[PDB]
Amino acid sequence: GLKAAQKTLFPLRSIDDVVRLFAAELGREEPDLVLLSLVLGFVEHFLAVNRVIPTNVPELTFQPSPAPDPPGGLTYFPVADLSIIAALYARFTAQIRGAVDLSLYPREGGVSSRELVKKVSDVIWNSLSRSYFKDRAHIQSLFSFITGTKLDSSGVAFAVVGACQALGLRDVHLALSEDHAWVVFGPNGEQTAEVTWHGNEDRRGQTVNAGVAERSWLYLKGSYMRCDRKMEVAFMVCAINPSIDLHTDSLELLQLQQKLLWLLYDLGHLERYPMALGNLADLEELEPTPGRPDPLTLYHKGIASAKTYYRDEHIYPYMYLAGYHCRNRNVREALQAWADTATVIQDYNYCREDEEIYKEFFEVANDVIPNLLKEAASLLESALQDPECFAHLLRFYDGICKWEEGSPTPVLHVGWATFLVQSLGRFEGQVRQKVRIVSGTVAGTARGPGPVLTFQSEKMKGMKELLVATKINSSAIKLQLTAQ
Numbered sequence: 129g130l131k132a133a134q135k136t137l138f139p140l141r142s143i144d145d146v147v148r149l150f151a152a153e154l155g156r157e158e159p160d161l162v163l164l165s166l167v168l169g170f171v172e173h174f175l176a177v178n179r180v181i182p183t184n185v186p187e188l189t190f191q192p193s194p195a196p197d198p199p200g201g202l203t204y205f206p207v208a209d210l211s212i213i214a215a216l217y218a219r220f221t222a223q224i225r226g227a228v229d230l231s232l233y234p235r236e237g238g239v240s241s242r243e244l245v246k247k248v249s250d251v252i253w254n255s256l257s258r259s260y261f262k263d264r265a266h267i268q269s270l271f272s273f274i275t276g277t278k279l280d281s282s283g284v285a286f287a288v289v290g291a292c293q294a295l296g297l298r299d300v301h302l303a304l305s306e307d308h309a310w311v312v313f314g315p316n317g318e319q320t321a322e323v324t325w326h327g328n329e330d331r332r333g334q335t336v337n338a339g340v341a342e343r344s345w346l347y348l349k350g351s352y353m354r355c356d357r358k359m360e361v362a363f364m365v366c367a368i369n370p371s372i373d374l375h376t377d378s379l380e381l382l383q384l385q386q387k388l389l390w391l392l393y394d395l396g397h398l399e400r401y402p403m404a405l406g407n408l409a410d411l412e413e414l415e416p417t418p419g420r421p422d423p424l425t426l427y428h429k430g431i432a433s434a435k436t437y438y439r440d441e442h443i444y445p446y447m448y449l450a451g452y453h454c455r456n457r458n459v460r461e462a463l464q465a466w467a468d469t470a471t472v473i474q475d476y477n478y479c480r481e482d483e484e485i486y487k488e489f490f491e492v493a494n495d496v497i498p499n500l501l502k503e504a505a506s507l508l509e510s511a512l513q514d515p516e517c518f519a520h521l522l523r524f525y526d527g528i529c530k531w532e533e534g535s536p537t538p539v540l541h542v543g544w545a546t547f548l549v550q551s552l553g554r555f556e557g558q559v560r561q562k563v564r565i566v567s568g569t570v571a572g573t574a575r576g577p578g579p580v581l582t583f584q585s586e587k588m589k590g591m592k593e594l595l596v597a598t599k600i601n602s603s604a605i606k607l608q609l610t611a612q
């Protein structure tokens with residue numbers, strides 16, 4: 129049951145028609161997330177999941193339009209009928225409102241009870257069909273939910289907040305960290321309740337307090353994102369996955385996203401959203417929008433956003449930057465940024481379901497850095513002659529030992545140790561000996577009338593003068609890395 133203001137915006141014959149729809153909804157008081165998420169789901173289906181166009185199907189129709197050179201020729205965008213999307217929309221509303229009874233739960237001064245929210249979660253929980261033995265992609269949107277009843281972990285949380293909007297509940301909102309989503313609610317908006325899975329132990333109906341308390345990356349020591357309705361649109365925008373298969377991405381779904389991120393950027397709703405500022409910078413690198421800022425400019429906004437709004441406890445802000453440096457073959461600035469990545473992670477404790485960030489750290493230490501160094505060593509006969517890199521490298525390994533400290537699980541093992549020695553070896557003994565490790569002479573500075581380094585970790589302190597030697601001790605370091 130949409131408004132006539134919404135209905136006249138259709139049909140969506142192009143990306144610009146979608147971008148237009150999204151702009152109009154942002155200007156309204158409560159943006160219709162259900163509508164918007166369906167539109168993203170619809171278009172993505174044809175643009176990525178099932179590109180083949182049917183024969184004897186009057187319901188659907190496509191719009192020809194020139195494609196850019198070198199490719200040239202035309203491209204056929206799926207025209208969103210109002211008749212199609214109106215039906216889908218009304219099924220969801222009828223499903224949710226048919227499933228629940230709002231007049232039972234007396235929201236005394238608009239107070240949605242924890243009782244009430246657990247029901248809405250359970251309505252989404254009982255109707256879904258989970259892809260267990262396969263990792264299905266493109267199962268994020270309410271299109272996927274209404275059509276196939278398949279949703280990824282994060283999409284379940286989003287689906288609840290959709291239903292909460294479908295029942296007029298303004299106070300229920302999507303919470304998320306860098307790799308997990310739940311719901312945030314209350315009068316002052318400080319309740320937490322799990323509404324999904326992660327990878328595992330099924331725990332819905334609980335607060336996220338124990339997660340915060342144990343200093344795990346998945347919950348960010350409390351410094352996670354609380355979304356207003358406008359930020360929830362930026363999430364569904366970010367959830368667009370253009371990949372047809374492993375190595376190919378759809379150009380239309382790129383442009384669609386890249387355009388839609390800029391719109392939000394202008395309206396100001398990427399201000400408290402670091403990961404979105406990185407994704408737009410990643411897109412700018414691939415295809416730079418004409419008359420717009422640079423990736424670096426956009427990456428540094430995401431860093432400051434995390435520093436100001438999120439207590440400088442986010443990790444990906446720095447990794448976004450180092451990757452750009454890495455793909456540009458600027459070896460000094462990349463390690464520097466990976467050392468800054470270590471600065472944040474040192475003050476965590478590695479718990480079991482912080483799986484995703486380990487994988488990223490592992491790849492830097494054991495694939496990307498040695499790749500860059502193998503390039504650098506071949507390029508030499510320089511960043512290897514430049515002693516500033518080795519100070520950054522040691523501080524990157526420093527934070528991972530410190531990360532590991534205070535955990536129930538070990539981080540480092542023999543597999544890691546090989547590449548440390550390989551990377552250590554890439555710098556000459558003349559270069560590495562110049563670095564000075566000190567405790568500190570005097571604290572502070574005052575207004576009156578070689579390069580320094582400092583380890584926080586026990587392990588790097590344990591091998592202080594082993595790292596600085598003339599000839600490398602490959603056997604001894606491997607052992608001293610691992611400990612109880």
Ligand SMILES: CCN(C(=O)c1cc(F)ccc1Oc1nncnc1N1CCC2(C1)CN([C@H](CCCN(C)CCOC)C(C)C)C2)C(C)C
Nearest residue numbers: 282304305306307308309366367403404410413444447448
């Ligand atoms: C990406 C899907 N997604 C989640 O995985 C997710 C789901 C949740 F529940 C919570 C958070 C979540 O993470 C993100 N939340 N908001 C925005 N983006 C998220 N992504 C997570 C992975 C991501 C962004 C990309 N990662 C970076 C790599 C970028 C590499 N690029 C593409 C290369 C460019 O080369 C030209 C970092 C490793 C640096 C961070 C959300 C959007 C539904």
Ligand code: NA
Nearest residue numbers: 476530531533
């Ligand atoms: Na630690």
